[PDB]
Amino acid sequence: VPKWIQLNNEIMIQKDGKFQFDKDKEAVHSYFVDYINQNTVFFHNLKEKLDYLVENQYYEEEFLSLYSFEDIKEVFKTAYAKKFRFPSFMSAFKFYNDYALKTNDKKKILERYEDRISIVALFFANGDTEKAKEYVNLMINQEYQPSTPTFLNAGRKRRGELVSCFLLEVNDSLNDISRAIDISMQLSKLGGGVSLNLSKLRAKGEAIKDVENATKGVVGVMKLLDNAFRYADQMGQRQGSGAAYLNIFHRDINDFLDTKKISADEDVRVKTLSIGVVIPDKFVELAREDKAAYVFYPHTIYKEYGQHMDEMDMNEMYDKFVDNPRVKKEKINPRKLLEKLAMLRSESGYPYIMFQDNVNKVHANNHISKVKFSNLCSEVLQASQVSSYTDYDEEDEIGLDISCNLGSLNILNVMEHKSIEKTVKLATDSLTHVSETTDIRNAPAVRRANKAMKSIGLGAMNLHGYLAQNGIAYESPEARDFANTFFMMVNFYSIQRSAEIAKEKGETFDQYEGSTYATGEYFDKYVSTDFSPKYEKIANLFEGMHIPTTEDWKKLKAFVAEHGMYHSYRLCIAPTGSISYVQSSTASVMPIMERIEERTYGNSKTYYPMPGLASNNWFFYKEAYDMDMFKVVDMIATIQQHIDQGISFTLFLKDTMTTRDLNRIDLYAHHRGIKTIYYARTK
Amino acid sequence: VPKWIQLNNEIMIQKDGKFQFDKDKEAVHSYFVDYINQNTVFFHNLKEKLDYLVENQYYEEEFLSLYSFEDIKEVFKTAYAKKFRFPSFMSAFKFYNDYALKTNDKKKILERYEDRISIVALFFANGDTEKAKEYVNLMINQEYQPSTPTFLNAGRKRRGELVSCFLLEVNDSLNDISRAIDISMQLSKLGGGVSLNLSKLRAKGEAIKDVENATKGVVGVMKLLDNAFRYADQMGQRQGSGAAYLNIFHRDINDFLDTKKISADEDVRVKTLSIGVVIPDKFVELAREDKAAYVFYPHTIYKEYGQHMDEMDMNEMYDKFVDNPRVKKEKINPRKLLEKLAMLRSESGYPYIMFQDNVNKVHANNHISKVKFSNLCSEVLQASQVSSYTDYDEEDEIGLDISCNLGSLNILNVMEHKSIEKTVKLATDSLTHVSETTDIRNAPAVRRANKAMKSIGLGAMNLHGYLAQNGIAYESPEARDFANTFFMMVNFYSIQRSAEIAKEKGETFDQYEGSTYATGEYFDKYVSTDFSPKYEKIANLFEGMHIPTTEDWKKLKAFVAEHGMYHSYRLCIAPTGSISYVQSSTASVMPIMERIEERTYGNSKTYYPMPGLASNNWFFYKEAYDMDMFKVVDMIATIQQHIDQGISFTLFLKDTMTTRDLNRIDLYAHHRGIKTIYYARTK
Amino acid sequence: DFTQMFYNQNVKQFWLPEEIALNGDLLTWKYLGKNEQDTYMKVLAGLTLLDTEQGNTGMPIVAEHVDGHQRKAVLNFMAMMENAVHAKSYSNIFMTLAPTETINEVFEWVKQNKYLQKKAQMIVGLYKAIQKDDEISLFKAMVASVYLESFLFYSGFYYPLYFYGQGKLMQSGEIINLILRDEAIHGVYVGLLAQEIYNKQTEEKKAELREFAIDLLNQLYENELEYTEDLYDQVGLSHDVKKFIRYNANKALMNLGFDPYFEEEDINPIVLNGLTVEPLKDDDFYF
Amino acid sequence: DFTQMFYNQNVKQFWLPEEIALNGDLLTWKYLGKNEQDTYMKVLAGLTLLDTEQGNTGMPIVAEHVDGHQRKAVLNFMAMMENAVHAKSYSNIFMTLAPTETINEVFEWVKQNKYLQKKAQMIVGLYKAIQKDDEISLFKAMVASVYLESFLFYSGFYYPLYFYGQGKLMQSGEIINLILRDEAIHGVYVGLLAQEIYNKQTEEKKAELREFAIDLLNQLYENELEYTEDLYDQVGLSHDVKKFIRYNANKALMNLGFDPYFEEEDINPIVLNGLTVEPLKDDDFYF
Numbered sequence A, B: 001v002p003k004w005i006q007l008n009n010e011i012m013i014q015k016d017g018k019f020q021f022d023k024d025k026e027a028v029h030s031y032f033v034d035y036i037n038q039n040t041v042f043f044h045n046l047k048e049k050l051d052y053l054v055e056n057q058y059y060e061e062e063f064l065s066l067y068s069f070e071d072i073k074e075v076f077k078t079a080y081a082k083k084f085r086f087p088s089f090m091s092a093f094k095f096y097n098d099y100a101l102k103t104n105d106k107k108k109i110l111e112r113y114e115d116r117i118s119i120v121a122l123f124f125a126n127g128d129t130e131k132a133k134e135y136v137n138l139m140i141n142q143e144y145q146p147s148t149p150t151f152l153n154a155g156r157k158r159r160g161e162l163v164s165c166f167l168l169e170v171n172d173s174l175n176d177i178s179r180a181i182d183i184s185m186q187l188s189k190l191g192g193g194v195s196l197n198l199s200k201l202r203a204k205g206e207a208i209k210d211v212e213n214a215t216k217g218v219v220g221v222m223k224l225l226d227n228a229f230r231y232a233d234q235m236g237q238r239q240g241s242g243a244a245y246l247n248i249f250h251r252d253i254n255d256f257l258d259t260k261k262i263s264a265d266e267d268v269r270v271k272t273l274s275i276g277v278v279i280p281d282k283f284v285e286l287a288r289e290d291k292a293a294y295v296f297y298p299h300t301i302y303k304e305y306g307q308h309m310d311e312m313d314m315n316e317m318y319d320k321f322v323d324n325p326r327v328k329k330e331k332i333n334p335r336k337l338l339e340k341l342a343m344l345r346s347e348s349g350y351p352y353i354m355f356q357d358n359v360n361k362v363h364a365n366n367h368i369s370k371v372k373f374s375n376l377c378s379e380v381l382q383a384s385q386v387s388s389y390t391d392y393d394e395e396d397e398i399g400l401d402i403s404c405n406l407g408s409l410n411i412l413n414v415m416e417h418k419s420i421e422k423t424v425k426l427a428t429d430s431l432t433h434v435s436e437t438t439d440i441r442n443a444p445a446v447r448r449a450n451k452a453m454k455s456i457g458l459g460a461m462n463l464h465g466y467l468a469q470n471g472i473a474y475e476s477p478e479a480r481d482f483a484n485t486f487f488m489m490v491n492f493y494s495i496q497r498s499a500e501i502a503k504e505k506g507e508t509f510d511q512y513e514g515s516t517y518a519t520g521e522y523f524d525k526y527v528s529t530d531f532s533p534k535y536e537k538i539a540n541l542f543e544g545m546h547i548p549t550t551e552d553w554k555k556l557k558a559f560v561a562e563h564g565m566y567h568s569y570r571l572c573i574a575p576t577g578s579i580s581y582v583q584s585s586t587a588s589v590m591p592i593m594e595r596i597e598e599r600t601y602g603n604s605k606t607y608y609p610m611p612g613l614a615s616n617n618w619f620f621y622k623e624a625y626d627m628d629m630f631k632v633v634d635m636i637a638t639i640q641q642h643i644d645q646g647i648s649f650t651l652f653l654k655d656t657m658t659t660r661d662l663n664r665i666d667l668y669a670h671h672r673g674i675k676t677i678y679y680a681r682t683k
Numbered sequence C, D: 001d002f003t004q005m006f007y008n009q010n011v012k013q014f015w016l017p018e019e020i021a022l023n024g025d026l027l028t029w030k031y032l033g034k035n036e037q038d039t040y041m042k043v044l045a046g047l048t049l050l051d052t053e054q055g056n057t058g059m060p061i062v063a064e065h066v067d068g069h070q071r072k073a074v075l076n077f078m079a080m081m082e083n084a085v086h087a088k089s090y091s092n093i094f095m096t097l098a099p100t101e102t103i104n105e106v107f108e109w110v111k112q113n114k115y116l117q118k119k120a121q122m123i124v125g126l127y128k129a130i131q132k133d134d135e136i137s138l139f140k141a142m143v144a145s146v147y148l149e150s151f152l153f154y155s156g157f158y159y160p161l162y163f164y165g166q167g168k169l170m171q172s173g174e175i176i177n178l179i180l181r182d183e184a185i186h187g188v189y190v191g192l193l194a195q196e197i198y199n200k201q202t203e204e205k206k207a208e209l210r211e212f213a214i215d216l217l218n219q220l221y222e223n224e225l226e227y228t229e230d231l232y233d234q235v236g237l238s239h240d241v242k243k244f245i246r247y248n249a250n251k252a253l254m255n256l257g258f259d260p261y262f263e264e265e266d267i268n269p270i271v272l273n274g275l276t277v278e279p280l281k282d283d284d285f286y287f
């Protein structure tokens, strides 16, 4: 048992009736002094270290060559000038076991935290030494955290793709299904999560070439995708992860959900494929009135109307489909389907729930397409256009496949530094650079959509940590007030940066003219409503920072109308799973799951108290399972009104909650504007 | 119970201690008069029938448009003038249940045997009325039977491909694996069986982009392919069938073989994928000497030498691989592997055995490539070149896949009509037409190889039937003498027809100049040896038929040298299972499994005596399980010396036989020049 | 050839009523109509009454007459499951769904019911007719036992499985599924013991035992059809229940090594959702 | 007043020998003298015989004659433990420690051993003498069963406990302690049923029943002495075991509501050391 592990395990040894939280600083100090300083490869100077790293195929020389060595040395000195110290053992452990560069034999540490931050900043700046120093200050202050792919792989020759979220539209044809399998394997090989929309595939029992009862439905394609994701396991260290989304009005919806039942037969079970369901307002209306609903065979609709079922407005087309004899449909119980969804989410946490009308009533790019499905983390909500993959020697009709590179603001550190605007703009610039440097060679629609849309995802983390470290209950009205003001400011400054980038580069995203940004319909609520804090306590937290007013939003609206917007999508709140430890921040905007996180690494167990946890703020670090999920829904809906994409929203349920409680939580989320529901976690 | 079925069941009711074989003629007559005539659609004339079939999307109008209706009427009269009568109930039942065209509801019969024969002949003639009449005479006389795909689909609008056997080379890359899955699905969608060569895939535990132990091996690709074949199961009318071949020296050979163990875990077990093993003479030599053998990692060999392991001569490169430190290899026990193969074949009948050196010591196109694997039926042995499928927007290096369209000579009918030359030449013409009219637009290598090599497979059936009806024991030396003479004549006339086609079209197959036909090495044994019957009884069977001599073979050799050859491959004896009932013949060249076949169709059991079975020839209709497999191997080796491709060779084993007996049979077949062993059937 | 294997499967399937919490069934029970509640109660009482006969008489009487220590142990284990586990489980379901007075009345009704009594007494009659050292009478009782375990219970199991497949009465449906899984293995095991006796008989005696089994099946089947209409017509399910009875009759026959009696039928999908190596010798390589 | 608590105790004590890994005893077994191993094998074989008959015959027959479904459920469970758990556990021990020939020999030895045959003859004879509706014959068999549970097993239990207490053969010893824990509650339960019958009698009849119980105990005791000497003389422990069986005879009498018969003695201190889903309503869609 190592000394640092012994010190960390002393956290739970209560002394004087209170946890010994100070043992974590001792634990991290001992961890460093006894493992990291010993196992760190020694270089005489930065020049020798950089030459060794570049020569040994560690660092790409393309990005480093853009700077004179004096500039690189200055950036590295800027990174080390802060004297950054990890405040807890878990943060340093996570960094030096997951992200710190290690020799090919994985026995020595080539990168410190400062070295990794400096390399990432140099990669971001793209030759701008002052920009690189600004990025170094942003990341060393831990105001902005690049996503795990960008942070880990940036500047590395062996690096994989800096983007990790991929959404693919699958067309209803064998050629398209084969291409989807190939692209899913190609993207998983790169380590990115791949989400597929199966709503266009015809249901089981549909005809292929005037041959009836030939189609196998979406479950056969799901088995193919599950096998493909299992094969492309990314060395096996992280098993291949894929998500399949199906509209609730698809015929195969019941079979689609049955793949996640434990009682399901093994020939139907899909082990490695997450499933999400897209629920239009029509289904909720049908269940509310207890009316009998119908699930439609997609190919009959496509033949009758020449357009896909999921390409149409179900709230306008459901009655026409029901009344159309040429459309094939079978009756279902919408309330029975909702209860089945709740039961499945309780048993396995699946499927993800996407409220299509909640997403598309605020979607700015409905002209390009409506948001038909989400990603593997349930927070990516963008317009997609399906591709037409034809026969060999036939030209393909490449559509738009969704992808975004992620970054997270550290709310606590952004508020402590009073640098919301600067942090947001620098994060937007870094995300734009990552998007511009991405080129996927086996996903034509992904690459085309990356070039055309320039979609980025700027999330946030440490909301609960910041609130608890400030004497604010997560469920309290003041917490929602702060979230409203902060995320309104984030949206304002991200829109301003996008417009400024469009003005500087002279280009907007493809089909920007038809977006709600161009027509000004996006800014209606911001020019009509004031989002300043309504509580004095919350308003004081923003002291020293300028909170945009309706006049500021009017000016920004005029500026956007003049110059346009560079990004079709800017904000999405991803889970931010493992990089939160490095930042010593709570995960995303969700409430904390546990006050002290007990985990076993190797054969020694480690304890991770929530950042800033102490006796004074112990009660404010309320666990999610003890929280009223209605208040969590209220907070997420408050945040979501300023996020153009979705928010990964996990439901934390007690074992005593029935399926009716889960159904009520989902119905309240739909009522409150929640776009997606990620997971049903039960204590 | 149907009256005809009751008449047929009277076959087994012994009268005077003898089977009532005459009851089958009554059974077939009753079947016709009571079901076929009743359920046969009525048309006033042939013109009306043709119009109805064309307009109702039953026939392809293009091929029928090449004839004036007078010529079509003449062809149909030629087919009908024969007054062909099915000799048994099973023949007519099989035809009218599998191949006879039925209305879209499968309620009425639109085609009789004469109608199908006439349509096939008109499709073959490609606008030649005299040629169409010749084809009608050939088929109605039942001297030639086109393969089930051609016979069923020729001249039909809603038809699958006329070629049903495809062989795919798979390159060691993710792009190639995904393309292989896509091509397999596309080809199974067409109803054809797909065989894939997995010997170029690196073994489990190999590096993927300088990261070690990243490869899943051939078993992961096998799971992918098995799911792909299960998905593309021909609209459920016929489960997708595929075969995977692995060289015995591949490291994954034991894992590859274990996929067929009953005790195998469902994760590794492959259910719908047939497996064959390619055994070079080196492995047999190692097992014979009991020396420790090595299985190699293909990617290490490729990196060390720049070529694939299966692209190199194992008999020469085995010692170099063993002595090369940069080539990774695993010690194995060759005799233990042989015994494992024997036990696996006894338990499940797998794997197929391909003796690589037996195939290639007589292979005429080794300059194009060695034969590396076989098809799903183990009778296709052609040179293939692997394709290089690159990233999207890059140019693919299209290689050569394998596909041949099959037809079977009815040995009994050909010998009775003394029409070996005419039947062989007409069958060659029809197979050439089928190959020319075939175009797969989703398998670039298959299409390119079909256009370049012009490979056809001309098989034979009713060998045991013809011999038994002539008082010759299948295992007798006289039977082998007849097979030698007959198949020598078949090869002679197929070569002559190929040369005549090359002269008429002024074009040979791609890379013919490097073949053994061009250099004359092919004809060495034919110009130096005589194949006329050595028994007076067999020599009498050929009375009225010219048996080519050494002078004839020298003249043919000179003719080929002057004009070349149109077909790279001409002859392959496929199992020919379903259409054997229609032809009233024993399947392929194999001995009969049972004198009377008991089948269940619905709740009615049907009895099928072996064609021509009677009291006086009961002893000559010896069942295969009672024969000496060494004598069957001798027969197949006698036949195989005149077949350029392989012979689908099934082993019929008694339950008392140990794995040692199966191994001895395999070793004798390898000694006797057998190329492939299809199935190990146990009684 | 089989007793130790069945021993293993039996003991590893051990369970207790307390493991499933029943109270949450009241959240779907309250939403059923009177006819649905009535049918469920009557079916449940039918199963309870038949299973009690199996625990008090059927399994112990067979254990008494079968020779072999290991067989007696397996049979004892099965008798234990009837009396200690199944009987308590049925009681628990009842006490959860109905008040004491309602339970007493349902049992009074089902106790007087003509179709339930006919089958219960037919089975019990064969158990009472077993004679010491007479394997023919033992076989007849084993046939009766297999018919109860693998066939007669299923007109009853249908309804809980039907609800279970719809998401209704899930806790009691889980219990019923565990019970049914035990009865399935009981039926298979007793079936193998019956086949052992059957195989010791002459050809004429075999034909006579086959006639006995088919005749008994016919009597029970015709009464099951009446039992089925009596309970299920009021909830419109009798047609589908009849298919389920025949399908399970065929399983019971197969347990006794006999051919299926009824043509194959598909079952209601809701109920379905509820449910010689020798080594080479160095000369084999030379010819 | 007691069956329910015995039911709960019995089912909560449920176990299987496979829960205990036995390969840990391999070395302490190897190290025992041939005399010690012989006595140990024979002791467990004698126990196996007793449990075989208690499971096959004793417990099922008492279950048959005792009224009340809950009483029958307890007795059926106890019967299952005897032959499906206890008797089988000894084979698990034998199969671990001994080669097949030694196992075969010890089972042959039980068949020909006169003391073991006599005690089986006496106990099983009384079980098979029970007459339906005759409470006196039932009482006599229950006395026999208590004497088997609480007295007769103990000449056998001594030796595994003696080793367990010295830290030897502790895995086998763990199995034996579980068996002993079961028999203690089995003896109490059957004792309470016997007392029920005894308490119904006249004073004159009671006096005769005490005579029966004491005469039977003495007859079994005298036979057990000879059995004990036969097994334990070769390991030097016969006198010690005799004290132990007298101690347990008193416990058997007490289980029957009778006064102790033997005087108290010091037992070897080593041996003492050896001891949910609910539907959505309309209001759920409004907030």
Ligand SMILES: Nc1ncnc2c1ncn2[C@@H]1O[C@H](COP(=O)(O)OP(=O)(O)OP(=O)(O)O)[C@@H](O)[C@H]1O
Pocket (backbone or CB within 6 Å): A028, A029, A032, A033, A037, A083, A084, A085, A086, A087, A092
């Ligand atoms: N919690 C920590 N987080 C990050 N690095 C640390 C931490 N503790 C120690 N280190 C690294 O280990 C070095 C030695 O730590 P230590 O506390 O002994 O330093 P010091 O000599 O007191 O002065 P200084 O704190 O300025 O380094 C530190 O300089 C820093 O490089």
Ligand SMILES: Cc1cn([C@H]2C[C@H](O)[C@@H](COP(=O)(O)OP(=O)(O)OP(=O)(O)O)O2)c(=O)[nH]c1=O
Pocket (backbone or CB within 6 Å): A171, A172, A173, A174, A175, A177, A201, A202, A207, A208, A209, A210, A214, A215, A216, A217, A220, B189, B231, B232, B233, B234, B235
């Ligand atoms: C070929 C094939 C397709 N499918 C499914 C997958 C596709 O979504 C769907 C359409 O197949 P397609 O490849 O589009 O077939 P098609 O276009 O030639 O026929 P059609 O125009 O009538 O659609 O059928 C199967 O389920 N099994 C199969 O074998």
Ligand SMILES: Cc1cn([C@H]2C[C@H](O)[C@@H](COP(=O)(O)OP(=O)(O)OP(=O)(O)O)O2)c(=O)[nH]c1=O
Pocket (backbone or CB within 6 Å): A189, A231, A232, A233, A234, A235, B171, B172, B173, B174, B175, B177, B201, B202, B207, B208, B209, B210, B214, B215, B216, B217, B220
């Ligand atoms: C991507 C991937 C490949 N493989 C196997 C299948 C291929 O035959 C083999 C090579 O993959 P490739 O697609 O060729 O990968 P690569 O070309 O980038 O790497 P290299 O330079 O080493 O060739 O690796 C897996 O088993 N799992 C995977 O996830």
Ligand SMILES: [Mg+2]
Pocket (backbone or CB within 6 Å): A172, A173
């Ligand atoms: Mg299509």
Ligand SMILES: [Mg+2]
Pocket (backbone or CB within 6 Å): B172, B173, B174
């Ligand atoms: Mg490669």
Ligand SMILES: [Mn+2]
Pocket (backbone or CB within 6 Å): C051, C054, C081, C082, C086, C179, C183
């Ligand atoms: Mn029961």
Ligand SMILES: [Mn+2]
Pocket (backbone or CB within 6 Å): C054, C082, C149, C182, C183, C186
């Ligand atoms: Mn039972």
Ligand SMILES: [Mn+2]
Pocket (backbone or CB within 6 Å): D051, D054, D081, D082, D086, D087, D179, D182, D183
């Ligand atoms: Mn016991």
Ligand SMILES: [Mn+2]
Pocket (backbone or CB within 6 Å): D054, D078, D082, D149, D182, D183, D186, D187
């Ligand atoms: Mn006991």
